[PDB]
Amino acid sequence: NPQEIHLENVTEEFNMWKNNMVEQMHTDIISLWDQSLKPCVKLTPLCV
Amino acid sequence: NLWVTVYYGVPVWKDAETTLFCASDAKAYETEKHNVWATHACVPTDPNPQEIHLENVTEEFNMWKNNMVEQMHTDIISLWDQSLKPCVKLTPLCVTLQCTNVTNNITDDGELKNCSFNMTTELRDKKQKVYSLFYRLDVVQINSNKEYRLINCNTSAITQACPKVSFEPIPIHYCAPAGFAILKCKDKKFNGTGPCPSVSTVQCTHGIKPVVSTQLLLNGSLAEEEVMIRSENITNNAKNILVQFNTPVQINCTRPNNNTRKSIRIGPGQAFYATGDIIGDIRQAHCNVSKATWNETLGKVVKQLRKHFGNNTIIRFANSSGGDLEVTTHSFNCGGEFFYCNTSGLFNSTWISNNDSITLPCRIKQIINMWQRIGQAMYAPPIQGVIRCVSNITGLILTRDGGSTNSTTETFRPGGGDMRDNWRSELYKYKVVKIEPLGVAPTRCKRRV
Amino acid sequence: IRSENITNNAKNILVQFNTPVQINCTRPNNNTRKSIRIGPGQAFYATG
Amino acid sequence: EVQLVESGAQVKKPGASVTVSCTASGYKFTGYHMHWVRQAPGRGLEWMGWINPFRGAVKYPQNFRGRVSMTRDTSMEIFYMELSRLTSDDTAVYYCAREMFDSSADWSPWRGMVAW
Amino acid sequence: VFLGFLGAAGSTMGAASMTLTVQARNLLSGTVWGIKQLQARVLAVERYLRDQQLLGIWGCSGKLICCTNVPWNSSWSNRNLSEIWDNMTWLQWDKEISNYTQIIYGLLEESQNQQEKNEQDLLALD
Amino acid sequence: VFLGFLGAAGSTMGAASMTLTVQARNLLSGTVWGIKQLQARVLAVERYLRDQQLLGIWGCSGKLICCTNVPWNSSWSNRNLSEIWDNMTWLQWDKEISNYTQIIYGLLEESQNQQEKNEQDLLALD
Amino acid sequence: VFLGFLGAAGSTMGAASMTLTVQARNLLSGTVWGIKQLQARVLAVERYLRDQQLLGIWGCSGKLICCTNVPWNSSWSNRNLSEIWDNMTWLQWDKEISNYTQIIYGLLEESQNQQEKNEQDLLALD
Numbered sequence A: 001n002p003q004e005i006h007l008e009n010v011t012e013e014f015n016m017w018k019n020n021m022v023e024q025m026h027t028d029i030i031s032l033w034d035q036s037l038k039p040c041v042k043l044t045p046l047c048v
Numbered sequence B: 001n002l003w004v005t006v007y008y009g010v011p012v013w014k015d016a017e018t019t020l021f022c023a024s025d026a027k028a029y030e031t032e033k034h035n036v037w038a039t040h041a042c043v044p045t046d047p048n049p050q051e052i053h054l055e056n057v058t059e060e061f062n063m064w065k066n067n068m069v070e071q072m073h074t075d076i077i078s079l080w081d082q083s084l085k086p087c088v089k090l091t092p093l094c095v096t097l098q099c100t101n102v103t104n105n106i107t108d109d110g111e112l113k114n115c116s117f118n119m120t121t122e123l124r125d126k127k128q129k130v131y132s133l134f135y136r137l138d139v140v141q142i143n144s145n146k147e148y149r150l151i152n153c154n155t156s157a158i159t160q161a162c163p164k165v166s167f168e169p170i171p172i173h174y175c176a177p178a179g180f181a182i183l184k185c186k187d188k189k190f191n192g193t194g195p196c197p198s199v200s201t202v203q204c205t206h207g208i209k210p211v212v213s214t215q216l217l218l219n220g221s222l223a224e225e226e227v228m229i230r231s232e233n234i235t236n237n238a239k240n241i242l243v244q245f246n247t248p249v250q251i252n253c254t255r256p257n258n259n260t261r262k263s264i265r266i267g268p269g270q271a272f273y274a275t276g277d278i279i280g281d282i283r284q285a286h287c288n289v290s291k292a293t294w295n296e297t298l299g300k301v302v303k304q305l306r307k308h309f310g311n312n313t314i315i316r317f318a319n320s321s322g323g324d325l326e327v328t329t330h331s332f333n334c335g336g337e338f339f340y341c342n343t344s345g346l347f348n349s350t351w352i353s354n355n356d357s358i359t360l361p362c363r364i365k366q367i368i369n370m371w372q373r374i375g376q377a378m379y380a381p382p383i384q385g386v387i388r389c390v391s392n393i394t395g396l397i398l399t400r401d402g403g404s405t406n407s408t409t410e411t412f413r414p415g416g417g418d419m420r421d422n423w424r425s426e427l428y429k430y431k432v433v434k435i436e437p438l439g440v441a442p443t444r445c446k447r448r449v
Numbered sequence C: 001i002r003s004e005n006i007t008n009n010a011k012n013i014l015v016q017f018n019t020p021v022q023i024n025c026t027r028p029n030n031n032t033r034k035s036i037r038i039g040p041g042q043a044f045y046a047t048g
Numbered sequence D: 001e002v003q004l005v006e007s008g009a010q011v012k013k014p015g016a017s018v019t020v021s022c023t024a025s026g027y028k029f030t031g032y033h034m035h036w037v038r039q040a041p042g043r044g045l046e047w048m049g050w051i052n053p054f055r056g057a058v059k060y061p062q063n064f065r066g067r068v069s070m071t072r073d074t075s076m077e078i079f080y081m082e083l084s085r086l087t088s089d090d091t092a093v094y095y096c097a098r099e100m101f102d103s104s105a106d107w108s109p110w111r112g113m114v115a116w
Numbered sequence E, F, G: 001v002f003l004g005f006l007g008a009a010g011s012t013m014g015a016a017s018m019t020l021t022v023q024a025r026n027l028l029s030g031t032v033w034g035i036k037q038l039q040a041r042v043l044a045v046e047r048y049l050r051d052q053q054l055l056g057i058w059g060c061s062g063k064l065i066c067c068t069n070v071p072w073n074s075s076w077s078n079r080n081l082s083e084i085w086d087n088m089t090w091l092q093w094d095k096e097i098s099n100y101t102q103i104i105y106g107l108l109e110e111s112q113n114q115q116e117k118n119e120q121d122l123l124a125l126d
Ligand SMILES: *[C@@H]1O[C@H](CO)[C@@H](O[C@@H]2O[C@H](CO)[C@@H](O[C@@H]3O[C@H](CO[C@H]4O[C@H](CO[C@H]5O[C@H](CO)[C@@H](O)[C@H](O)[C@@H]5O)[C@@H](O)[C@H](O)[C@@H]4O)[C@@H](O)[C@H](O[C@H]4O[C@H](CO)[C@@H](O)[C@H](O)[C@@H]4O[C@H]4O[C@H](CO)[C@@H](O)[C@H](O)[C@@H]4O)[C@@H]3O)[C@H](O)[C@H]2NC(C)=O)[C@H](O)[C@H]1NC(C)=O
Pocket: D001, D002, D025, D026
């Protein structure tokens, strides 16, 4: 139940462009990417 | 009639040890270059390194049993490999090398070799025929023209610290967490053992460059008033003895050769940075030291030894005994490169009681096993051109001779090689404790019913 | 006699002794270990 | 267990040079001091020096200094000793011994000689 | 007057009870080689809450000061009140009392708040 | 008498209130395969401080015992005082009350210290 | 009435003192990419116990409300009682008082519990 609680009389200034949650998501996808490739098969011998 | 009464946050501490953490400030953090030496994740230093003095506190200090050294000893080694692991592994570089005495017009009796060898490329099938110039200490021959091979091939897997990462020592401030603290012993004449008269607490040390070096200490802290003589036990010749200058000493270290760096592709993503041919004059590394302040330094020192040894006696200096090249010579990184220098004429002297400078020969070695750990070596890529580094000598390490002749003469030579002594240079005044904020003392007080 | 369920043959059944039992295990052959250098830092210990 | 194994008996001319080895095993090699002692026939023990395998730190005595070359091979775990300018007075039986307590970090000792 | 953290240590205990709000205020202080710094700051809250646990199981739980209904055995550093607070530093003092500390603590946690707090409900049920 | 940690469990609750200083004293207990031991000891302070949070938001925050102004609904295990403390172990008891625990807790945190503590300032402003 | 966590924020502070048991109840909330989630939940107990430390070193340590013997300098947001609690939200208010907070805090930790609690033993020794 993704509880969503509303707050009243609260004026909050939002910025999506300076939002830090993006840079995290940016890095995790790259790290998680290699976390797959490291146990996976290295094709370095395929240069031929 | 007295009772027991608990008091929280009392000035009661006990001596213990735990894990500390670095402070590189922010300025050498900007050196960057993809992890220059240490500083990567290092915490910033306090802008105002608050030093609080404690009164009526007699604290016994020991620099030789101080645990902060062994930590610093291990971190530098781990951080070392943490660079080499993403860096380029040179394990394929173990190969038969066809080399020649370097090109010069006689007047020798070399040490540099024009080395042609069959290598490999990024494309796994096709291969490479290349030449590079190597110092004699990184290779050894094998038994037409003589053939050579690397020195580490039969010992340890060799890597190469990638040229992005540097070796440059960056000042590091070791810090302690809450419930603990660090104590600085500030009293001017202090032998490092026994009680410390001047006890002040800090949460971080001063700037400490983890200088990786032997036989000489550079860039560190200076002593005060007389030059201080510190040894755990002086009756044992085997235990190393450390000194601290009140006067810093200048030295200019140079690699006068103008090097070329040949980057050859062993990849994909791998590659090896070789040494190209010297451009112009063939010279050799060396470092200069003023003979005047040197002679006066030995005079000011010999007056300090005559407090601990004899009122009037004889003091002789002689060159070293034997061991690995990392001991028998002076090791350190000058900007990218690790120099190994002959120290002899400094110590050619005999002293009893009552304008020019000097120069020392030096050698460069790229493959380095430093801290001796086998199974893993490292290669230091060559730096392009003339290398120059200026250093300020703040400390020393020495050993003594043996019975010889009764009350006759004592001889001194270089020593050390265990880098734990390198960290004792800045850690002599430091030690760690832990807080016991709870305490129970009697008074007429009693709680309720 | 301990078993999760004894009516199922498939489930393993475990026992515990009150009396320990002696056994002498030997490799009577006298082996040689040939250490051959695959390095640097690598090496392989063969049978002589 | 540990073992200290030396080279073989040699017959040489005077004024020449002679090398003698010692090969330790069964312990941490780089972290254990190695003494060397010669005993002339019928005489007492004559201590010729020691070599710390850590980086190769050495210390000799006064009377033997300059004729004694002592090294170790940390790879192959073989200590070495050499005597030159051979004299008839240099004829003796030469030993290698280890100090009692050693480690890779802190140190001490002096006295200890156990494995010979 | 603010002498900072641990200022009154060598000072006598009676003079050292004025800094309790200092030493207790900074006591909590509010990839490789990054692990180095992380494990260090964990030991503070364990050392802090262990005292809070001891302070809690005893009759205190209130910070900086406390008393108890446990008497002081003269076998514990027999001294006059002035020979202790006025004549002895917390360093010299806790040196003497490290003997019976847990013997003292046992009565604080058990003879007091295991006992005196059970007296509450028996008095508070009516 | 010291029976140790969790000694009075099977004993009746009235007999189990004497060990509270025991079970609360050791409750805080003062590379690969090294991670195995580290994550285990973290869950203690979370379980400890969660109680401290609950004990704090309720009218207690004092250790080992407490009461409240919230009445006991007879719909919660209707029993006589002797049928509960004297006739039931904490195991058999908390089995019955695990029903209304949070229903009880809601009044302890809100009807009490959200309410009775607001009564303080209104009485303490004058 | 239960408005949930942070419900009264934009509401005036006088109206925001009714949720203290809410915002303090969930404040503690009871390999690679697995490290991502672990370091996050650690900062809660540090932020929680730091308040407990501040609340402890001051004259409070009791949850959700407190007062002090430190007067309010008119140089700190000079306003009438209605211009503050009734006319200002905690957001608009703490905006003004973030100025003197530590100046206020210094007297709470030192002028109060370093002082008023020392008054205890001096009165409690006889
Ligand atoms: C169920 O439990 C039982 C009992 O617990 C298990 O039985 C065990 O079986 C093991 C083998 O499977 C066996 O392990 C060997 O132990 C040997 C003994 O080690 C001790 O003693 C030596 C020497 O002391 C002897 O001599 C002295 C003085 O003269 C006497 O005082 C002693 O009583 C002995 O007589 C000490 O040096 C040790 O410190 C011990 O105290 C070991 O020697 C042996 O190790 C050797 O082989 C290893 C494998 O290759 C090797 O790594 C190691 O280095 C050893 O190599 C020897 O030779 C080399 C040659 O170069 C030399 O360099 C070395 O120094 C060394 O001499 C084994 O470890 C157990 O002893 C035996 N008992 C116990 C109590 O454990 C049973 O296995 C178990 N079942 C299962 C399934 O687990």
